[PDB]
Design a protein around this ligand. Structure first.
Ligand SMILES: C[C@H]1O[C@H](O)[C@@H](O)[C@@H](O)[C@@H]1O
Ligand SMILES: C[C@H]1O[C@H](O)[C@@H](O)[C@@H](O)[C@@H]1O
Ligand SMILES: C[C@H]1O[C@H](O)[C@@H](O)[C@@H](O)[C@@H]1O
Length: 254
């Protein structure tokens, strides 16, 4: 895996790896968070905090000691750190060895939430996905289907219940676009879309509570570039056999 999911913990020699296999970020049993090149050359570290330590992705990437204190932190510059950000923010380790933190706000949703869903889990539908009639996605007791008849439907699986639909009869494709929009089409005719064309790539989240949201990557911080006041344009990365988060890369300079 090349990423860390919200709240993920790693410790005692657990690690992630850049898509190309060259860089590895390992939270060591001696409590040193270390970036390795080719498996053998360490090229960055926190330095060790000692045994019983751990690293957790919780808005910041935070290094804790046995005693439960934070010993090192990404120290991402934030207005507020709302507890819900810790449930949302994720990290990617990329092919030139940089790693960065994303915290993305929903741009669109099948429904408007009065407040965050506790312990919700998102099935990520990545930028560039083209759904074709017959495509479906399953998360818990819900199913997102792009149907033979062109409708995009969210069903509760057992018992079977329609929760939401677009009624885009005759659509032959739905595209999660690089420009930021999610668009259902017959041919080149857009029958329905989210109105989120920003030029920052889209991805979708399909929840285990029967909801769909579109977000776009908002890169806040990298190891090499520190905190970023404006999020740069990033590009879909190589989805891994299973990663749980979106995967991106970002340019080295301008
Ligand atoms: C699987 C679904 O596929 C069709 O497209 C639609 O009309 C439904 O009647 C059917 O249940
Ligand atoms: C929401 C419903 O809308 C249409 O009736 C058709 O696409 C069905 O299969 C679908 O379940
Ligand atoms: C509805 C249209 O909105 C934007 O122009 C762009 O996202 C197009 O691809 C889209 O189809």
């Amino acid at each position: 895996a090349s990423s860390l999911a919200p709240r993920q913990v790693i410790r005692d020699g657990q690690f992630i790896t850049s898509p190309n296999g060259k860089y590895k970020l390992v939270m060591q049993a001696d409590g040193n968070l270390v970036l390795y090149e080719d498996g053998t050359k360490p090229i960055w570290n926190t330095t060790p905090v000692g045994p019983g330590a751990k690293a957790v992705m919780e808005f910041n990437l935070n290094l804790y000691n046995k005693a439960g204190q934070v010993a090192w932190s990404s120290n991402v510059y934030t207005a507020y750190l709302f507890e819900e950000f810790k449930d949302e923010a994720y990290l990617n380790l990329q092919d030139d060895g940089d790693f960065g933190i994303f915290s993305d706000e929903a741009k669109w949703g099948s429904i408007v939430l009065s407040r965050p869903e506790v312990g919700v889990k998102n099935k990520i539908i990545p930028t560039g996905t083209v759904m074709v009639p017959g495509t479906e996605y399953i998360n818990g007791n819900y199913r997102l289907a792009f149907q033979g008849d062109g409708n995009l439907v969210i069903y509760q699986i057992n018992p079977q219940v329609v929760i939401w639909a677009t009624y885009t009869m005759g659509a032959d494709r739905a595209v999660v676009q690089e420009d930021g929009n999610f668009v259902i089409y017959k041919g080149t005719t857009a029958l329905w879309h989210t109105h989120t064309a920003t030029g920052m790539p889209a991805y979708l989240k399909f929840t285990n509570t029967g909801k769909l949201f579109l977000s776009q990557p908002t890169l806040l911080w990298t190891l090499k570039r520190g905190s970023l006041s404006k999020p740069p344009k990033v590009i879909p990365g190589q989805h891994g056999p299973l990663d749980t988060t979106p995967i991106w890369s970002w340019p080295h300079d301008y």
